[PDB]
Amino acid sequence: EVQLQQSGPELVKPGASVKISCKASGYTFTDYYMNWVKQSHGKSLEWIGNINPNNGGTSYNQKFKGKATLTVDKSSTTAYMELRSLTSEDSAVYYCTRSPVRPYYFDYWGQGTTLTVSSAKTTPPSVYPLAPGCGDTTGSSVTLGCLVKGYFPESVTVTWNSGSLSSSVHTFPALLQSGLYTMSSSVTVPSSTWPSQTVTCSVAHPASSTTVDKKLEP
Amino acid sequence: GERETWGKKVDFLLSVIGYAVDLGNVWRFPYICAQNGGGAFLLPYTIMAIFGGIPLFYMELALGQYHRNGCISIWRKICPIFKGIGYAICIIAFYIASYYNTIMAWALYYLISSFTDQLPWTSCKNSWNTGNCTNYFSEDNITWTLHSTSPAEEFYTRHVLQIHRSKGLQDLGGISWQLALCIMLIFTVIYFSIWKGVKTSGKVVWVTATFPYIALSVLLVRGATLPGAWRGVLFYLKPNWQKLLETGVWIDAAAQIFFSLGPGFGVLLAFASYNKFNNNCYQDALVTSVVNCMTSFVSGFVIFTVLGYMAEMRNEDVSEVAKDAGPSLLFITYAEAIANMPASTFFAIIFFLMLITLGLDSSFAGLEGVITAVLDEFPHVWAKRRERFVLAVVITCFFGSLVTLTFGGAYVVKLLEEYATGPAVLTVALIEAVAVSWFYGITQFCRDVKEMLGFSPGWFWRICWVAISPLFLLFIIASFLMSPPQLRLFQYNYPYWSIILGYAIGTSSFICIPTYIAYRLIITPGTFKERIIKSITPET
Amino acid sequence: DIVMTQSHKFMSTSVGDRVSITCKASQDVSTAVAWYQQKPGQSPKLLIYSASYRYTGVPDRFTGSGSGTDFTFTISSVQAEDLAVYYCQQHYSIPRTFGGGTKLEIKRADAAPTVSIFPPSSEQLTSGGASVVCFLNNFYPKDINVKWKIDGSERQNGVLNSWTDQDSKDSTYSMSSTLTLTKDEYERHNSYTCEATHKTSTSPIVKSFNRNEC
Ligand SMILES: CC(C)CCC[C@@H](C)[C@H]1CC[C@H]2[C@@H]3CC=C4C[C@@H](O)CC[C@]4(C)[C@H]3CC[C@]12C
Ligand SMILES: CN(C)CCC[C@@]1(c2ccc(F)cc2)OCc2cc(C#N)ccc21
Ligand SMILES: *[C@@H]1O[C@H](CO)[C@@H](O)[C@H](O)[C@H]1NC(C)=O
Ligand SMILES: *[C@@H]1O[C@H](CO)[C@@H](O)[C@H](O)[C@H]1NC(C)=O
Ligand SMILES: CCCCCCCCCCCCCC
Ligand code: NA
């Protein structure tokens, strides 16, 4: 049950700083090096540096010298990474991963932390329902869906009926335009469950902390 | 009436080489050469020799064979006020001998433990290993942990050194009796090689100085036959010319060639004292130093072939397997590599024996210089029997090494070797380089060389003694004093006050030189110009 | 430093075929190569360590070979859930570097794109906008043309095509064509029509609806 739970997404203006946590469990925290890997959007993995939890024995990369600062707390078994002088290049997904001394592999990773470095205002998403028309031919399955327009940054989660059921949901990647993102979702459900039961789409925005729920109505 | 001489040219020709060649040639040069440009470190290493090392070595070696006096009585004939130098070195020696022998003690304890069919540092089923101990010929797939240790590291740390029984410099007592018996056997084997004078110290050197080259040859063809040994050589010779841009590696090279060459201490003075007056000094100094460097050069291969094999057996980056820059590179890394080879008992015995014979010749001379000076300063007040004085010195060094024989002895070794003895030897060497060149006169020195060798030394050497050598030492001293290195040994960072203790020990070594200057300045009657005139001009 | 070069950025394979990914390093590595699997939207997962050794909790179908500079990660039976990006990484010299990444796309038979058009809801009409949506579900491969028709005229402004990543169950792509328009312009046209041209059939799939309360 080795679990590495990081912090949530962070939206920060360029030039500021941001700190990411990493709560470890399921193993002897004082036994393994704690690492941080930077992954850019569409790019490869990039090892930032490690830290020895016993004494805070840091080992940074020459490419990240003076950019990232790694700390550790044994009282709560939690690692931290701080980034100062944030620019557009720092907007990426950061992981904290466990690793032995030899051989130096990354056995367990964290869930990641989406960092967005921009001065754009945190815009709440506009949730608009996408219900099928009343003139369509109800076949063996009807396809429903919900639309999300205008939000920043890329931090949104659209669920369907508390995750039950979702065996045919297609989610489309968000598109950035005029500083605001826009995405959409769909779900293929049989004709023996609609519009009989209750199907409601939930749109959550952790950056603005706004959760709007809309139910589909034909 | 007259003093003794050499039994044969080769005896002292190998005696000075034996003093010059030691452990550091074997292991200090390969590491500092690997991490400072690789093969490109060969470029500043020679420049600091030709311009810094060789002039001090030859200039030091000439005065001894010309004046034929000790480290103390030679200043009475040059600059009496600087006679304290001859005493300072003495005190310096007492500090040096406090740790330089204990290392050999360790090697000896490793040698007497290498007579077993199964070497102690191969398995983990011993009385000193912890639960972290993980060896090979064990289960595969093993993965190293932050707290895990190797049977070799466990054997050095918890058995011979026993450093786990001390918390640092604060609490280090008491004394380990094993290394005390070892260092007693060593202090006994050096007694019978000095007590008779230069007759035995020119005969015992025959063995102590020739064995390391044989052992290095065997270890060389051994490490060359090991699979994956090219990685250590590649990491050893890979040119990193960007290191030459850093002003640090030049100072590192200068210091390395100074301590390896060892001028300014009176050992070369004493060894040169017992020699023919018309004997050549140029060729002697040249040959000896060039061998001392070449020996370091091949020692680099001897180490990096084995460490390359060790990186092949593990996973590469020889820097990872050669992180620790100290005795651990020989007592743990190299030893653990030896344990995993056929005829491990053989390659262990000849290795530790090599270490002991590497140390012995340098301790022979190390003492020999001081003994020679003291006997020459207090003649026939002293010299009634030599064995008496040599014994009185050896015993004092034994009681002076009890601080090093403690459980936390290695800490004291680092502290004394880097914060105490070093800057003081460089300081007194600077004082000598200034006194001979700027007080006695470099022209008169070239005239003395012109008397012994029959011709005046070239301008290349004169311009070195006048300016190049004093600035050569000045650069190193200034570099250290401006930024003393942060000391670390075995996952233990030294307290912030360590530099205060080292400097305290360092200054207490040459408290004698200015107070003796004040002594003569307070003893000679008349004006201060007449006193400094009788103090600058040699004895009438 | 070390440069881990993955020449093939993308590789195509089918369900059941034998696929092998190559990894080229800068210098000699001996046996210090790790293979990681990163599924789209998840954190990297360690699969292979030290060239050939498998980590605990890894199926037997994933193997590894190579010794020096060129290394190979081999999958015998490709499954639908094996769709992920694979990375190679050296673990000997500091610092530890990674490869470019090889996105393993799965090849299968063609599929007819189910097209579904949707009229703007009243909640969006309250705010003052109207976007007609055209969904394209379950087709292969990714290459597919989407043409819009407001009232018979090919509409091209305000069209956004969004292609998703490949599926991990049946390996079928899906895309969304969005036509975002104003309310005033929306209330001046009735029957919208979006059509899609794919390689499964020569006749583009045409979907239409009426604004007059469906
Ligand atoms: C050889 C003689 C002349 C050197 C004496 C110099 C004195 C001042 C130096 C030498 C050793 C030093 C001490 C070394 C040990 C300790 C213990 C530590 O918990 C407090 C600092 C303290 C107490 C240092 C204070 C300064 C110190 C006492
Ligand atoms: C120089 N060659 C390599 C031998 C080194 C041994 C040494 C030496 C002197 C007195 C002894 F009793 C035993 C050994 O000779 C001079 C010297 C200076 C320092 C400094 N700082 C450290 C050690 C020594
Ligand atoms: C291993 O070493 C660590 C410290 O390095 C120590 O805390 C631990 O107790 C050791 N393990 C055992 C089994 O003693
Ligand atoms: C591999 O080594 C690890 C070291 O932590 C160990 O936990 C694991 O059990 C080993 N694998 C097997 C199959 O024993
Ligand atoms: C001539 C240069 C002497 C260098 C030795 C170290 C100097 C120490 C300065 C004074 C500190 C003394 C602490 C007790
Ligand atoms: Na020697």
PDB file of all heavy atoms in Angstrom, chain C residues 49-64:
ATOM      1  N   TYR C  49      13.723  -3.068 -15.066  1.00  0.00           N
ATOM      2  CA  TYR C  49      14.894  -2.465 -14.454  1.00  0.00           C
ATOM      3  C   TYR C  49      16.093  -3.362 -14.722  1.00  0.00           C
ATOM      4  O   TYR C  49      15.967  -4.588 -14.783  1.00  0.00           O
ATOM      5  CB  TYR C  49      14.698  -2.245 -12.943  1.00  0.00           C
ATOM      6  CG  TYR C  49      14.788  -3.502 -12.107  1.00  0.00           C
ATOM      7  CD1 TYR C  49      15.947  -3.816 -11.410  1.00  0.00           C
ATOM      8  CD2 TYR C  49      13.708  -4.368 -12.001  1.00  0.00           C
ATOM      9  CE1 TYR C  49      16.032  -4.962 -10.643  1.00  0.00           C
ATOM     10  CE2 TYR C  49      13.784  -5.516 -11.236  1.00  0.00           C
ATOM     11  CZ  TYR C  49      14.948  -5.808 -10.559  1.00  0.00           C
ATOM     12  OH  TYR C  49      15.028  -6.950  -9.796  1.00  0.00           O
ATOM     13  N   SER C  50      17.255  -2.733 -14.904  1.00  0.00           N
ATOM     14  CA  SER C  50      18.502  -3.427 -15.225  1.00  0.00           C
ATOM     15  C   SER C  50      18.342  -4.299 -16.473  1.00  0.00           C
ATOM     16  O   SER C  50      18.440  -5.527 -16.428  1.00  0.00           O
ATOM     17  CB  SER C  50      19.002  -4.245 -14.030  1.00  0.00           C
ATOM     18  OG  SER C  50      19.278  -3.402 -12.924  1.00  0.00           O
ATOM     19  N   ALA C  51      18.064  -3.630 -17.594  1.00  0.00           N
ATOM     20  CA  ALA C  51      17.977  -4.260 -18.909  1.00  0.00           C
ATOM     21  C   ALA C  51      16.863  -5.299 -19.009  1.00  0.00           C
ATOM     22  O   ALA C  51      15.900  -5.108 -19.758  1.00  0.00           O
ATOM     23  CB  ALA C  51      19.319  -4.898 -19.285  1.00  0.00           C
ATOM     24  N   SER C  52      16.991  -6.406 -18.275  1.00  0.00           N
ATOM     25  CA  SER C  52      16.115  -7.560 -18.446  1.00  0.00           C
ATOM     26  C   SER C  52      15.222  -7.864 -17.252  1.00  0.00           C
ATOM     27  O   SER C  52      14.147  -8.439 -17.439  1.00  0.00           O
ATOM     28  CB  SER C  52      16.944  -8.811 -18.768  1.00  0.00           C
ATOM     29  OG  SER C  52      17.856  -9.104 -17.724  1.00  0.00           O
ATOM     30  N   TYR C  53      15.635  -7.510 -16.037  1.00  0.00           N
ATOM     31  CA  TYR C  53      14.875  -7.885 -14.852  1.00  0.00           C
ATOM     32  C   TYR C  53      13.524  -7.182 -14.800  1.00  0.00           C
ATOM     33  O   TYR C  53      13.411  -5.987 -15.085  1.00  0.00           O
ATOM     34  CB  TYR C  53      15.671  -7.579 -13.581  1.00  0.00           C
ATOM     35  CG  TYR C  53      16.915  -8.422 -13.416  1.00  0.00           C
ATOM     36  CD1 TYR C  53      18.158  -7.958 -13.827  1.00  0.00           C
ATOM     37  CD2 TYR C  53      16.846  -9.684 -12.839  1.00  0.00           C
ATOM     38  CE1 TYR C  53      19.295  -8.730 -13.672  1.00  0.00           C
ATOM     39  CE2 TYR C  53      17.974 -10.463 -12.682  1.00  0.00           C
ATOM     40  CZ  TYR C  53      19.196  -9.982 -13.099  1.00  0.00           C
ATOM     41  OH  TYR C  53      20.321 -10.758 -12.941  1.00  0.00           O
ATOM     42  N   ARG C  54      12.492  -7.948 -14.459  1.00  0.00           N
ATOM     43  CA  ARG C  54      11.145  -7.427 -14.292  1.00  0.00           C
ATOM     44  C   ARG C  54      10.922  -7.022 -12.843  1.00  0.00           C
ATOM     45  O   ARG C  54      11.493  -7.608 -11.919  1.00  0.00           O
ATOM     46  CB  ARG C  54      10.098  -8.469 -14.695  1.00  0.00           C
ATOM     47  CG  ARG C  54      10.297  -9.080 -16.069  1.00  0.00           C
ATOM     48  CD  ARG C  54       9.173 -10.054 -16.390  1.00  0.00           C
ATOM     49  NE  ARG C  54       9.391 -10.747 -17.655  1.00  0.00           N
ATOM     50  CZ  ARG C  54       9.949 -11.948 -17.762  1.00  0.00           C
ATOM     51  NH1 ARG C  54      10.345 -12.596 -16.674  1.00  0.00           N
ATOM     52  NH2 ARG C  54      10.108 -12.503 -18.955  1.00  0.00           N
ATOM     53  N   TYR C  55      10.086  -6.010 -12.648  1.00  0.00           N
ATOM     54  CA  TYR C  55       9.742  -5.561 -11.310  1.00  0.00           C
ATOM     55  C   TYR C  55       8.544  -6.354 -10.794  1.00  0.00           C
ATOM     56  O   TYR C  55       7.802  -6.974 -11.560  1.00  0.00           O
ATOM     57  CB  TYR C  55       9.450  -4.059 -11.315  1.00  0.00           C
ATOM     58  CG  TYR C  55       9.347  -3.432  -9.945  1.00  0.00           C
ATOM     59  CD1 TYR C  55      10.486  -3.190  -9.189  1.00  0.00           C
ATOM     60  CD2 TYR C  55       8.120  -3.056  -9.417  1.00  0.00           C
ATOM     61  CE1 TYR C  55      10.406  -2.607  -7.940  1.00  0.00           C
ATOM     62  CE2 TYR C  55       8.029  -2.470  -8.166  1.00  0.00           C
ATOM     63  CZ  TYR C  55       9.177  -2.248  -7.433  1.00  0.00           C
ATOM     64  OH  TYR C  55       9.095  -1.670  -6.190  1.00  0.00           O
ATOM     65  N   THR C  56       8.365  -6.337  -9.474  1.00  0.00           N
ATOM     66  CA  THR C  56       7.266  -7.074  -8.862  1.00  0.00           C
ATOM     67  C   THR C  56       5.931  -6.474  -9.282  1.00  0.00           C
ATOM     68  O   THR C  56       5.757  -5.251  -9.278  1.00  0.00           O
ATOM     69  CB  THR C  56       7.388  -7.059  -7.339  1.00  0.00           C
ATOM     70  OG1 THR C  56       7.396  -5.705  -6.869  1.00  0.00           O
ATOM     71  CG2 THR C  56       8.669  -7.752  -6.897  1.00  0.00           C
ATOM     72  N   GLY C  57       4.989  -7.337  -9.651  1.00  0.00           N
ATOM     73  CA  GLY C  57       3.691  -6.870 -10.093  1.00  0.00           C
ATOM     74  C   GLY C  57       3.634  -6.500 -11.555  1.00  0.00           C
ATOM     75  O   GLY C  57       2.858  -5.616 -11.933  1.00  0.00           O
ATOM     76  N   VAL C  58       4.438  -7.146 -12.392  1.00  0.00           N
ATOM     77  CA  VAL C  58       4.475  -6.885 -13.825  1.00  0.00           C
ATOM     78  C   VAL C  58       4.181  -8.184 -14.556  1.00  0.00           C
ATOM     79  O   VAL C  58       4.814  -9.202 -14.267  1.00  0.00           O
ATOM     80  CB  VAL C  58       5.830  -6.311 -14.280  1.00  0.00           C
ATOM     81  CG1 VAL C  58       5.883  -6.201 -15.797  1.00  0.00           C
ATOM     82  CG2 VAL C  58       6.075  -4.956 -13.633  1.00  0.00           C
ATOM     83  N   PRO C  59       3.222  -8.204 -15.483  1.00  0.00           N
ATOM     84  CA  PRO C  59       2.912  -9.430 -16.227  1.00  0.00           C
ATOM     85  C   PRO C  59       4.134  -9.998 -16.936  1.00  0.00           C
ATOM     86  O   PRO C  59       5.124  -9.306 -17.189  1.00  0.00           O
ATOM     87  CB  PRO C  59       1.847  -8.976 -17.231  1.00  0.00           C
ATOM     88  CG  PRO C  59       1.199  -7.804 -16.569  1.00  0.00           C
ATOM     89  CD  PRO C  59       2.305  -7.103 -15.826  1.00  0.00           C
ATOM     90  N   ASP C  60       4.044 -11.283 -17.275  1.00  0.00           N
ATOM     91  CA  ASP C  60       5.153 -11.991 -17.901  1.00  0.00           C
ATOM     92  C   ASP C  60       5.319 -11.631 -19.370  1.00  0.00           C
ATOM     93  O   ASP C  60       6.355 -11.956 -19.960  1.00  0.00           O
ATOM     94  CB  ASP C  60       4.950 -13.504 -17.769  1.00  0.00           C
ATOM     95  CG  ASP C  60       4.818 -13.950 -16.327  1.00  0.00           C
ATOM     96  OD1 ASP C  60       5.853 -14.265 -15.701  1.00  0.00           O
ATOM     97  OD2 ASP C  60       3.676 -13.989 -15.822  1.00  0.00           O
ATOM     98  N   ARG C  61       4.323 -10.976 -19.969  1.00  0.00           N
ATOM     99  CA  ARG C  61       4.358 -10.639 -21.386  1.00  0.00           C
ATOM    100  C   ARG C  61       5.325  -9.500 -21.697  1.00  0.00           C
ATOM    101  O   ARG C  61       5.692  -9.322 -22.864  1.00  0.00           O
ATOM    102  CB  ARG C  61       2.946 -10.294 -21.867  1.00  0.00           C
ATOM    103  CG  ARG C  61       2.319  -9.103 -21.159  1.00  0.00           C
ATOM    104  CD  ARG C  61       0.959  -8.756 -21.742  1.00  0.00           C
ATOM    105  NE  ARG C  61       0.357  -7.611 -21.065  1.00  0.00           N
ATOM    106  CZ  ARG C  61      -0.463  -7.705 -20.022  1.00  0.00           C
ATOM    107  NH1 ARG C  61      -0.781  -8.896 -19.533  1.00  0.00           N
ATOM    108  NH2 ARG C  61      -0.967  -6.610 -19.467  1.00  0.00           N
ATOM    109  N   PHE C  62       5.737  -8.725 -20.692  1.00  0.00           N
ATOM    110  CA  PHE C  62       6.694  -7.639 -20.882  1.00  0.00           C
ATOM    111  C   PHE C  62       8.106  -8.143 -20.606  1.00  0.00           C
ATOM    112  O   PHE C  62       8.399  -8.595 -19.494  1.00  0.00           O
ATOM    113  CB  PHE C  62       6.385  -6.471 -19.949  1.00  0.00           C
ATOM    114  CG  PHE C  62       5.001  -5.924 -20.094  1.00  0.00           C
ATOM    115  CD1 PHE C  62       4.007  -6.291 -19.203  1.00  0.00           C
ATOM    116  CD2 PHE C  62       4.694  -5.037 -21.108  1.00  0.00           C
ATOM    117  CE1 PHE C  62       2.730  -5.787 -19.326  1.00  0.00           C
ATOM    118  CE2 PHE C  62       3.417  -4.528 -21.236  1.00  0.00           C
ATOM    119  CZ  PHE C  62       2.433  -4.905 -20.343  1.00  0.00           C
ATOM    120  N   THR C  63       8.976  -8.076 -21.613  1.00  0.00           N
ATOM    121  CA  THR C  63      10.366  -8.481 -21.463  1.00  0.00           C
ATOM    122  C   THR C  63      11.306  -7.334 -21.823  1.00  0.00           C
ATOM    123  O   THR C  63      10.902  -6.305 -22.381  1.00  0.00           O
ATOM    124  CB  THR C  63      10.682  -9.711 -22.325  1.00  0.00           C
ATOM    125  OG1 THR C  63      10.452  -9.403 -23.705  1.00  0.00           O
ATOM    126  CG2 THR C  63       9.810 -10.890 -21.917  1.00  0.00           C
ATOM    127  N   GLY C  64      12.591  -7.572 -21.562  1.00  0.00           N
ATOM    128  CA  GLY C  64      13.655  -6.626 -21.843  1.00  0.00           C
ATOM    129  C   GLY C  64      14.975  -7.278 -22.206  1.00  0.00           C
ATOM    130  O   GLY C  64      15.325  -8.328 -21.658  1.00  0.00           O
TER     131      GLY C  64
END
